[PDB]
Amino acid sequence: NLAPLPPHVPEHLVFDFDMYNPSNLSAGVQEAWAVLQESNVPDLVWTRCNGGHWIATRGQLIREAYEDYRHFSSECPWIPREAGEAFDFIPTSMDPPEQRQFRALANQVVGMPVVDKLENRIQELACSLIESLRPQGQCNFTEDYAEPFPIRIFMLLAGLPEEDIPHLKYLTDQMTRPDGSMTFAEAKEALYDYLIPIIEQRRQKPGTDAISIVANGQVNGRPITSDEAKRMCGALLLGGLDTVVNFLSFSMEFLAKSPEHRQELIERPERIPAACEELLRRFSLVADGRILTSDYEFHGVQLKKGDQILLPQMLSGLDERENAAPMHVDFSRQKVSHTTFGHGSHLCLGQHLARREIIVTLKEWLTRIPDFSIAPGAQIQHKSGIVSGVQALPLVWDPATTKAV
Numbered sequence: 261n262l263a264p265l266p267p268h269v270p271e272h273l274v275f276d277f278d279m280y281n282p283s284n285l286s287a288g289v290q291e292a293w294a295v296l297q298e299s300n301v302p303d304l305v306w307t308r309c310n311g312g313h314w315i316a317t318r319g320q321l322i323r324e325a326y327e328d329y330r331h332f333s334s335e336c337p338w339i340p341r342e343a344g345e346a347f348d349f350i351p352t353s354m355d356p357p358e359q360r361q362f363r364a365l366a367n368q369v370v371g372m373p374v375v376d377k378l379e380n381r382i383q384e385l386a387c388s389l390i391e392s393l394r395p396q397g398q399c400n401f402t403e404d405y406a407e408p409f410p411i412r413i414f415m416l417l418a419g420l421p422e423e424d425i426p427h428l429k430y431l432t433d434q435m436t437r438p439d440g441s442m443t444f445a446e447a448k449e450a451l452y453d454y455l456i457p458i459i460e461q462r463r464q465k466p467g468t469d470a471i472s473i474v475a476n477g478q479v480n481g482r483p484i485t486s487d488e489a490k491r492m493c494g495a496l497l498l499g500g501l502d503t504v505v506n507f508l509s510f511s512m513e514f515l516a517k518s519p520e521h522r523q524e525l526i527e528r529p530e531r532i533p534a535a536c537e538e539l540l541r542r543f544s545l546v547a548d549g550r551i552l553t554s555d556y557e558f559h560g561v562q563l564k565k566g567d568q569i570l571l572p573q574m575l576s577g578l579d580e581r582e583n584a585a586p587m588h589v590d591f592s593r594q595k596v597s598h599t600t601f602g603h604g605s606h607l608c609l610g611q612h613l614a615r616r617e618i619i620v621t622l623k624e625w626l627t628r629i630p631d632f633s634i635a636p637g638a639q640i641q642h643k644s645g646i647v648s649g650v651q652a653l654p655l656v657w658d659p660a661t662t663k664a665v
């Protein structure tokens with residue numbers, strides 16, 4: 261339960277928040293994490309949960325810590341410490357300067373140039389899944405769209421057969437929202453056990469897929485190793501398999517209960533990109549951290565070398581000191597402030613792919629199924645972790661209110 265309070269941690273800064281099962285979860289994950297920003301909670305607190313660690317609660321500190329890699333290393337970015345110690349994905353577990361060379365190579369397989377070329381492909385799949393669900397008048401959004409849409413896109417880019425999805429998704433889920441069946445260490449080992457032969461055969465007979473590019477790539481002039489390639493593909497796998505999936509559910513859950521907001525984008529489709537950004541702020545869902553490289557006094561608090569600090573990317577945009585009425589969705593919001601795709605040298609490499617997947621979804625879905633709602637009685641459940649998600653999302657609609665395009 262509660263790890264004994266270290267001697268250096270002030271008793272009054274203790275706030276036992278449990279990132280894997282927050283107290284106010286029933287009200288929605290974002291709302292549950294938002295408790296850390298209530299009137300009497302400090303900018304920086306210590307929780308004795310999950311082994312004990314700090315938690316920056318305001319955007320100001322969060323952005324600062326992410327900028328200062330020398331004090332806040334990505335060496336151990338996962339909580340609990342055991343997971344963080346086993347975590348060695350590239351470039352995520354590295355700090356500049358060494359991080360850069362790998363980021364450049366990763367950026368080459370999921371970067372903008374690659375995204376633009378994938379546009380038509382993305383639209384075709386979006387249109388396909390929706391046009392098929394349309395006459396049915398109902399769907400289980402998580403498995404009928406949220407998962408297949410972005411996952412099939414990722415497997416395509418990676419050159420991996422879709423039959424492996426159930427196994428891979430389960431492993432990634434265990435790394436973000438473990439059900440207890442296995443440690444982060446175990447899930448990582450299994451992911452690597454899966455990648456090894458594939459990488460080997462790709463360096464051997466090089467193709468045009470993401471895996472082949474990484475496996476046969478160069479890092480600042482020199483050949484990447486088999487192990488480095490494995491570590492990088494793990495970073496790409498974790499990213500394009502769990503995050504967009506869940507975010508689409510948070511956004512659709514909201515749209516399903518917001519006819520006014522839907523009407524907005526229906527009438528003025530050009531507001532979709534901006535709406536996408538506001539949704540990214542309001543339904544931010546990622547929260548990982550850093551490890552102190554040395555004793556350091558941060559905002560009046562004595563942090564110790566080895567201490568772990570959670571810097572919830574989610575909280576920045578929900579901070580009222582960054583956005584007035586943060587919990588309100590406003591597609592017209594003048595200054596959408598957030599760190600949803602991270603902050604600093606680790607800014608999400610898949611953000612461009614993610615935005616495209618989000619916008620295309622909204623545009624292609626509202627254009628075919630403009631009127632829809634959440635199936636009655638359904639108590640929509642959220643789940644918290646490194647990456648928060650939506651358990652299930654039953655939607656319903658009158659086929660007569662739809663249109664084929």
Ligand code: HEM
Nearest residue numbers: 351352496499500503504507546601602606608609610614
């Ligand atoms: C809504 C969608 C997404 C969100 C909110 C998101 C969020 C994030 C966050 C917050 C980080 C920073 C972790 C840190 O600083 O420790 C990150 C890193 C990363 N993400 Fe994304 N992610 C998304 C989608 C994707 C996709 C689709 C991919 C493609 C595989 C991806 C690939 C990566 C990679 C490779 C990194 C590591 C970059 C580095 O460490 O330099 N992400 N992402």
Ligand SMILES: Clc1cc(Cl)c(Cl)c(Cl)c1Cl
Nearest residue numbers: 352495498499503546548
């Ligand atoms: Cl999408 C995504 C990809 C990677 Cl590689 C990491 Cl480390 C995190 Cl934390 C998130 Cl959220």
Ligand SMILES: [K+]
Nearest residue numbers: 335344345347
């Ligand atoms: K580590």
